[PDB]
Paper text:
Here, we study fold transition between distinct β-barrels by protein engineering and structural biology technique. Here, we discover that the previously reconstructed ancient DPBB sequence could also adopt a β-barrel fold named Double-Zeta β-barrel (DZBB), as a metamorphic protein. The DZBB fold is not found in any modern protein, although its structure shares similarities with RIFT and OB. Furthermore, the reconstructed OB fold could also be converted to the four-stranded SH3 fold by a simple circular permutation. Thus, these ancient β-barrel folds (DPBB, RIFT, OB, and SH3) could be readily interconverted by a few feasible mutations through the missing-link fold, DZBB, indicating their significantly close evolutionary relationships.
Furthermore, we verified that the 13 a.a. sequence forming the flexible β-turn in segment 1 in the OB-fold designs could be shortened to 7 a.a. Taken together, very short In/Del and a few point mutations are the determinants in the transition between the DZBB and OB folds.
Author numbering:
A (entry chain A), B (entry chain A): 1 to 49
């Protein structure tokens, strides 16, 4: 079961026009939309609104 | 170019064991890791750490 209070983060491997290819904790790489100011090598979080 | 100060959010369509299928603003649906407490119908954000 997902751990309560655990933040979810991914590493930015490639980015173009606000769309980042990120590596998740399990090592899987996927495209996501990322905010402006995010560069390759930066870390992003997935958080509940 | 990505708009500066614009938050990135996605809608949670399906979730299981901390892995959500979310719909991005463009309508594309993808699996992501999501924090504990995220249920179907919730909204998540992608934010720089």
């Amino acid at each position: 079961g997902p751990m309560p209070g655990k933040k979810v983060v991914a590493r930015v491997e490639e980015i173009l026009d606000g769309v980042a290819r990120v590596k998740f904790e399990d090592g899987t790489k996927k495209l996501i939309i990322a905010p402006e100011g995010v560069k390759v090598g930066d870390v992003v979080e997935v958080k509940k609104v």
